[PDB]
Design a protein around this nucleic acid. Structure first.
Ligand SMILES: [Cl-]
Ligand SMILES: [Mg+2]
Ligand SMILES: [Mg+2]
Ligand SMILES: [Mg+2]
Ligand SMILES: [Mg+2]
Ligand SMILES: [Mg+2]
Ligand SMILES: [Mg+2]
Ligand SMILES: [Mg+2]
Ligand SMILES: [Mg+2]
Ligand SMILES: [Mg+2]
Lengths: 120, 43, 226, 244
RNA sequence: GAUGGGGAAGCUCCGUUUCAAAGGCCUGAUUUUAUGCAGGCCACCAUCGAAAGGGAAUCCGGUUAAGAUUCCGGAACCUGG
RNA sequence: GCUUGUGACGGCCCGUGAAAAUCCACAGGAAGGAAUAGUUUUCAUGCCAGGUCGUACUGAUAACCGCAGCAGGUCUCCAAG
RNA sequence: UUGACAUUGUGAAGUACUUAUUCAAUGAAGCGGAGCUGGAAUUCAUUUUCCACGUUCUAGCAUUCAAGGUCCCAUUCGGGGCUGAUCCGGGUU
């Protein structure tokens, strides 16, 4: 006989699909981490306005890579300086660089970390 | 409506938050009377 | 018993929703399927000239089965079997100083359109099998006339794929026998007489009859009631 | 000269129809098994106004024969059709206002509207407000029906073509004068950009064949042959006669 | 404004659901491993188009030479998990 | 009283005065569930996270366009006696 | 716009067909033929024919391969045929 077709519409049948098994690698050498901790954090900002936040607001001011987001900045600060971060605010400066306001938790002081780095 | 409880969005009756009481009353009366008439039409 | 009830559904017009029925007749098939079935229809709606219409007659099941039994006894040698012959021949003539005749003469079915046509023109074929399924029909359309003029009995057999199976190919489209062993000579003679009564002896009248002209099912019913 | 006004309308840039507020195309149901064998009942849910159309529209909901759902249709309402009324469409429907029947199932003299030219095109004839079609005769052989059209022409149509019993609602609309230019402006605001119209004799020769001259006049016969080309067909095209 | 198609010597033109075999989330089946394999569901069939249309959710006080409904203090709310 | 929001109404049209994303309810009853034990994250409380780009200032008889620090031109909100 | 030739075939007589071509619709759903049932009907031996063959006081409701009937599994919580819902041709109309 013939197959019973309750629908008058014919549709493309589902066929097996195989995954790729290349004979050679696409590049054969993976690229290293494009944004590691030393690239996310470029250098601290040491203007007079930024120094007041360090003393008063318990906030460290950094210049960061334009490609880094808030997740990467928080992770980099913890690994580079062994501190805890409460929150991160970022902005793009008129000269084309990114500035991050990093506020530490109450268990840490921004003043003693700042002079441990070397800037004041 | 996705933040409030279900009691705010319904009434304890059939077709609670969809039809008013009078329309539900007409539905029940119409449903019963028509089905009774169908029986006598069959015989 | 007292919990189950009979609730028949009314499937009339305006009643309950219709159930799922077999709609294979109304299926919208892909384009390649529809063009495949309509070409079959078009080839029989139109008149068919006798040169092409002669291929509608094919050998019956019983005679075809007997034919393939004889042809299966003369299969060409396989690649694996050819390996044994060459290594035996090499160990025979190269070292034994033979005359390259340490192997018996082969008996096999002749195939190949160019090869078989040449055999017919030289009056060497004892029986020729012709496939009716060759889509470029011009390749085989002249063979019945060539066999008729050269006096070579021929048969239009069903299945080009079947002929390929006896020559270890996917498709052959023609096959022929030239030399047969003595023990099977009588068997071939029985087939030749039966085959000749169907194709060679009816060639004169078949060439004067047109095929085709068959109407569709609905047209046939309309033509009957008129 | 340059391209005249009636030639520019075919490009369809600013002369397209204004269709934002339209309720949808007004068509009959698709001719299916129920229509050609028996009948199917529908319910009128609401009667609504349609922008750019004088006649009102009726929304009728039917049950899907092959699936559990509801199908909505847009019909042109006839006089006397009301909300909540049951509508019967099919071969075996009764002769009542609002019912859809093929022309071969009604007697001579029946008044019908939204008549199909061919079976299955879903209504072509007698659609404007106040218009109707009169059945004048039948030809049982070769399945033909003679009808009378609103323009007075006699046409022969297949008896399987469907029609709606009654007359299109909204009649008498054109009997009230517009009375001012503002009312005409709002009328064509919902239809298309064809108003106002500048007379050709008021233009320059570059603009219109009637333009130019020290007096405002046409200068040649305004009756134009059917064989004239685009740019010439201004005036009275292939007029059999003129005057009152 | 692509695709499927059809035009044009061609740069390209038409058309937007079109004469197309146009697609994936609820699971069941499996404790070789990851998802192959069973019913049914749904056919809607790219994408672009609003800093005044539609739209999940924050307020007050204070603070700078120049920022804040964004920072500080206090007090809330929404979404996802 | 002024500005503004809103409610119930009334006049007018051969003009009857957008769409979609998104959210909820109902109809339906497929499944899943209790006795030494289970389901409810549409009741309350408690836990975590929420990226990316814009954000200064003028908005005009000097920060816009008119060759300019030009009596010209350029959309809008707040409105005391 | 008008004529000729090509596309361009098939049957008959002094217009007919289908298959090319052309128009339209449906997420190609019920087409064609026959067989059932009854109705009209007059039979001049029996059906020589035709029509019909689940739905019309009412702004309700209509979905889980359908309940039932029957036949299998190897009984467990369930499953699979046929009928329900007439056959035949795959020409979607
Ligand atoms: Cl003009
Ligand atoms: Mg920011
Ligand atoms: Mg002038
Ligand atoms: Mg001119
Ligand atoms: Mg002229
Ligand atoms: Mg384009
Ligand atoms: Mg967009
Ligand atoms: Mg400021
Ligand atoms: Mg500002
Ligand atoms: Mg300037």
């Amino acid at each position: 006989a013939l197959k019973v077709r309750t629908s008058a519409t014919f549709r493309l049948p589902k066929t097996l699909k195989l995954a790729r098994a290349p004979k050679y690698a696409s590049k054969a050498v993976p690229h290293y981490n494009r944004l590691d901790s030393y690239k996310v954090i470029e250098q601290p900002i040491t203007s007079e306005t930024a120094m007041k936040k360090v003393e008063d607001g318990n906030i460290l001011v950094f210049q960061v890579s334009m490609k880094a987001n808030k997740y990467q900045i928080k992770k980099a600060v913890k690994e580079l300086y062994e501190v805890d971060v409460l929150k991160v605010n970022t902005l793009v400066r008129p000269n084309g660089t990114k500035k991050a306001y990093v506020r530490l938790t109450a268990d840490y002081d921004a003043l003693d970390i700042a002079n441990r780095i070397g800037y004041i | 409506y996705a933040t409030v409880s279900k009691t705010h969005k319904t009434v304890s009756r059939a077709y609670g938050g969809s039809r008013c009481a009078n329309c539900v009353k007409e539905r029940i009366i119409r449903a019963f009377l028509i089905e009774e008439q169908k029986i006598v039409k069959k015989v | 018993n007292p919990l189950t009830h009979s609730t028949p559904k009314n499937f009339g017009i305006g009643q309950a929703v219709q159930p799922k029925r077999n709609l294979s007749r109304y299926v919208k098939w892909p384009e390649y399927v529809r063009v495949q079935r309509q070409k079959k229809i078009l080839s029989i709606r139109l008149k068919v000239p006798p040169t092409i219409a002669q291929f509608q007659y094919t050998l019956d099941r019983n005679t075809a089965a007997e034919t393939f039994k004889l042809f299966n006894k003369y299969r060409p040698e396989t690649a694996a079997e050819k390996k044994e012959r060459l290594t035996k021949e090499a160990a025979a003539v190269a070292e034994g100083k033979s005359k390259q005749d340490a192997s018996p003469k082969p008996y096999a079915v002749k195939y190949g359109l160019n090869h078989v046509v040449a055999l017919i023109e030289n009056k060497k074929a004892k029986l020729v099998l012709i496939a009716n399924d060759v889509d470029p029909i011009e390749l085989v359309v002249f063979l019945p006339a060539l066999c008729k003029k050269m006096g070579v009995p021929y048969a239009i057999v069903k299945g080009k794929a079947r002929l390929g199976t006896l020559v270890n190919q996917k498709t052959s489209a023609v096959a022929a026998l030239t030399e047969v062993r003595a023990e099977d000579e009588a068997a071939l003679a029985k087939l030749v007489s039966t085959i000749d009564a169907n194709f060679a002896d009816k060639y004169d009248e078949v060439k004067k009859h047109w095929g085709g002209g068959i109407l569709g099912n609905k047209a046939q019913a309309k033509m009957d009631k008129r | 000269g340059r391209v005249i006004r009636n030639q520019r309308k075919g490009a369809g840039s600013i002369f397209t129809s204004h269709t934002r507020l339209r309720q949808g195309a007004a068509k009959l149901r698709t001719l299916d098994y129920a229509e050609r064998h028996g009948y199917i009942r529908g319910i009128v849910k609401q009667i609504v106004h349609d922008s750019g159309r004088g006649a009102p529209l009726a929304k009728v909901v039917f049950r899907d024969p092959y699936k559990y759902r509801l199908r909505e249709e847009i019909f042109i309402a006839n006089e006397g059709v009301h909300t909540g009324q049951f509508i019967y469409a099919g071969k075996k429907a009764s002769l009542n206002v609002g019912n859809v029947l093929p022309l071969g199932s009604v007697p001579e003299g029946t008044i019908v509207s939204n008549v199909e030219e061919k079976p299955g095109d879903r209504g072509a004839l007698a659609r404007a407000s106040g218009n109707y079609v009169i059945i004048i005769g039948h030809n049982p052989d070769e399945n033909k029906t003679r009808v009378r059209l609103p323009s007075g022409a006699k046409k022969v149509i297949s008896s399987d073509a469907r029609g709606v019993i009654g007359v299109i609602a909204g009649g008498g609309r054109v009997d009230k004068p517009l009375l001012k230019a503002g009312r005409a402006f709002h009328k064509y605001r919902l239809k298309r950009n064809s108003w106002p119209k500048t007379r050709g004799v008021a233009m320059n020769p570059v603009d219109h064949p009637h333009g130019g001259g020290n007096h405002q006049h046409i200068g040649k016969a305004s009756t134009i042959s059917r064989g004239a080309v685009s740019g010439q067909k201004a005036g009275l095209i292939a007029a059999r006669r003129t005057g009152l």
